[PDB]
Design a binder for this molecule. Structure first.
Ligand SMILES: [Mg+2]
Length: 304
DNA sequence: GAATAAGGGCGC
DNA sequence: GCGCCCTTATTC
């Protein structure tokens, strides 16, 4: 199903000032929800958001983002089930790539001037498929050599279909007359507004950077001395920095939630935050095993 | 909206 | 790798 289908009628509500001409307006029955209202204009979906999501700590924003990911999965799966390569299916594939591989979206005007690439400006020459392994190799932002890879069956099968279309561009849609065009950043960003707004494409990189860091630390394992632990944190930041195509300083400062490092320094990793009851597991549906554990780790900061 | 057809993701 | 069952398109 779609997101608005799932979320599904017209003092707080008054302060939102939802335009009266909007049709089939829905409103949150709750002061906390990041999406406070949604409806349709004469033509398209319009939204009003919680102001704290348009000042929160990283751990707060990410816990809430993890709450939106199961809905994202339902919406993107629905779009992926379509036949051929219609716009929403190609955008769902691109959204999966943002999620699982932590791409920047990019833009045409930026790419044209800088001769560097992001997801929406990738060329066919930037990717290869070997069975279920999709590998990307491209010049990313600031000229950094970027490498990314995925293992998902659906991505691999559909990447092959995209590569069957005439080049040079990778992300194109075909209308089932056969008319062909690119998916540009503006169109993808509108799709994201629908399926995750008020969260944005950047939230995939902060969530994904934090997740990769947490996985790395769990896999490396805890250290007996805090000094030795801090060395592991240095290695972790540099690994995630390479994945994200950023400096270690920017990665530590803006991408990895420090809560993950706090827990590591106290000898706790993702393994320690696995669900302990059947409902605790069920509430993590639509998250990967490691994503679920990350959500629970971030939730421990609220608990204290 | 319902009945119909058939492509195709993802649980198994 | 199979195949249930969710998807869009078509017709009423
Ligand atoms: Mg098949």
């Amino acid at each position: 199903p779609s997101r608005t289908e799932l979320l599904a009628r017209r003092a707080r509500i008054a302060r939102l000032a939802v335009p009266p001409a909007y049709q089939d307006v829905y409103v949150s029955p709750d002061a906390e929800n990041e999406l406070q209202a949604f409806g349709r204009d004469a033509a398209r979906l319009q939204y009003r958001y919680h102001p704290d999501f348009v000042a929160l700590k990283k751990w707060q924003r990410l816990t809430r983002f993890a709450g939106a990911l199961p809905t994202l999965k339902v919406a993107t799966t629905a779009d992926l089930r379509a036949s051929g390569l219609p716009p929403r299916k190609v955008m769902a594939l691109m959204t999966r790539l943002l999620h699982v591989a932590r791409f920047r979206v990019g833009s045409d005007i930026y790419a044209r001037q800088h001769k560097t690439y992001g997801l929406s400006t990738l060329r066919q020459r930037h990717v290869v498929v070997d069975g279920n392994t999709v590998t990307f190799r491209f010049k990313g932002k600031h000229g950094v050599s970027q490498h990314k890879a995925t293992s998902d069956r659906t991505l691999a099968a559909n990447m092959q279909k995209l590569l069957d279309l005439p080049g040079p561009w990778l992300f194109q849609t075909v209308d089932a007359g056969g008319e062909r065009r690119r998916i540009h950043s503006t169109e993808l960003n509108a799709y994201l507004r629908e399926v995750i707004g008020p969260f944005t494409a950047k939230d995939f990189r902060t969530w994904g950077g934090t997740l990769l860091a947490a996985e790395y630390l769990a896999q490396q394992g805890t250290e007996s001395s805090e000094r030795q632990a801090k060395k592991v944190l240095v290695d972790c930041v540099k690994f995630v920095a390479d994945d994200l195509g950023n400096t270690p300083a920017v990665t530590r400062g803006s991408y990895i939630c420090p809560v993950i490092f706090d827990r590591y320094l106290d000898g706790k990793v993702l393994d320690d935050y696995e669900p302990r009851t059947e409902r605790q597991e069920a509430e993590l549906e639509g998250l990967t095993r490691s994503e679920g554990a990350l959500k629970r780790m971030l939730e421990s900061e609220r608990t204290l």
